[PDB]
Amino acid sequence: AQMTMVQAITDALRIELKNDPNVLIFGEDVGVNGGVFRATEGLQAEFGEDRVFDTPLAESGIGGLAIGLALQGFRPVPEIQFFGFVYEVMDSICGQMARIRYRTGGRYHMPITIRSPFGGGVHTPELHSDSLEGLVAQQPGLKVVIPSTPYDAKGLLISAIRDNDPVIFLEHLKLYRSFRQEVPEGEYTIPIGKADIKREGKDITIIAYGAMVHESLKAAAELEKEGISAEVVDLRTVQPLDIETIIGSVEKTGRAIVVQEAQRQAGIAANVVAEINERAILSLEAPVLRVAAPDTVYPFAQAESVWLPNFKDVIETAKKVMNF
Template identity: 60%
Template structure:
């Protein structure tokens, strides 16, 4: 097994699905000859040709509208939206169109579209490049929203997303692209799209996180272990649907929970997790639900990003607060 970066693991997964299914197509801005602005699709056009991997005009609504028409004519599109902030241009295609088509056709039409898009703060990008916009999308019925937190999951989940017959918004974390390596198996394997993972077992408190915050949570767990505090970390992986069973099983054991996300606090993923716990498993808790999230403000100017983004220190402080309640 090779040690791969998160981004190379995704490239590997895309290579795999292009090999296995001749109906798969990769397209978007700069994904062809240039291999994507981050090189996620590096080498794929050379290997599979310009009919399968191609550049499009610069228009996100066009790219996702194109995906719908291609899906209706028998293709399995894997469009890239260059940065998640740019999905704002294509909200109708996602929420008004592709996610509704199975319902419209009573199950007789599938929209096997995987929208890959990078997101996430900490790399000091231009405006609307690093925003975490998942809170906008998790409220759309018929759309899966997933995000891997490590290279192994990245490859297995991108293969699962492409093989899934429903539209999947596949969020790739910019900061993780080249900052971590994992053992990643060669060839075909899948990681389920709707199952959370216990990233680290523990018994005193549960941290529910996803994407880059999983790594922040793991840092906290390492640090507190030295004080004999045992932290369980759950990586949601799927933001819609949310695997509440794994969360409930954990808090039934730890009786305390902190939910950490990089996105703003209003509504969205963390709020949904808190609500699900409050509705179904509140009696397991012996302390309030703790939340760590970005403030409800605009994603900041790049030079101030690190002051705004929630990090391991914020999670640690919240964990201590809940433990000492």
């Protein structure tokens, strides 16, 4: 069916609740209310309060609760209401659940999926739209997934939940219901750690994730009229990186840019650039440049349009690389 990304996410959660009695969803307002963005709408009504439930208002406690529940054989899918609140629960995520398999030498493990919305363009209050994927990307023991489409979101979320180690699943607020896409009914999985080619090209590799994939595809449409063929690579997973797909593309084009919504000093672009320069510098016609936000705090809401990277910045930087 033609689904929005939020509908695709709900469908994944419903399917996992149905097929795995150990799956639990919990967090602030996910129960009766069905989530502040309706991502868990109807789940409690269908599957019960023992399985989908509200918690007290405390992110750290939500993290601890998930770790505990996992020690008791459950498959926790907690929600953090906005990923800007990850600062309250960083120890449970990075200090604890990322490390428990290692800490116990495989005696215990954490089949936990943390869902959290992020991303700009919808004029949220402070610390609602921040891109903090760069932080959890640096913690061994986690995987970090960021979909750009309904089809990807459902298949990656199901993979995430079935994965027996901690996965951070980040949902871009701008993409929740701004477009529809055909999504298969029933269960399907998409491999975690696997990028995909959103647009085949010959002249330059544009690597992106989240809302920036759309900005990159928009840019590639305009670059074509200019006689520049851009290959658009959606990372889908930002930790770990799909090195093979990235390098495969860069070796064909000999030119690349990396596009993120995060500040230049944040995000995962520097890691991608470092990996490309390490493995494929004998194919590079030019430096791999980054499209990123300015190194300030996330913008006051009215300043989003002038601060957030967009397709015009992707075009400008692409042509910079083309003309190097």
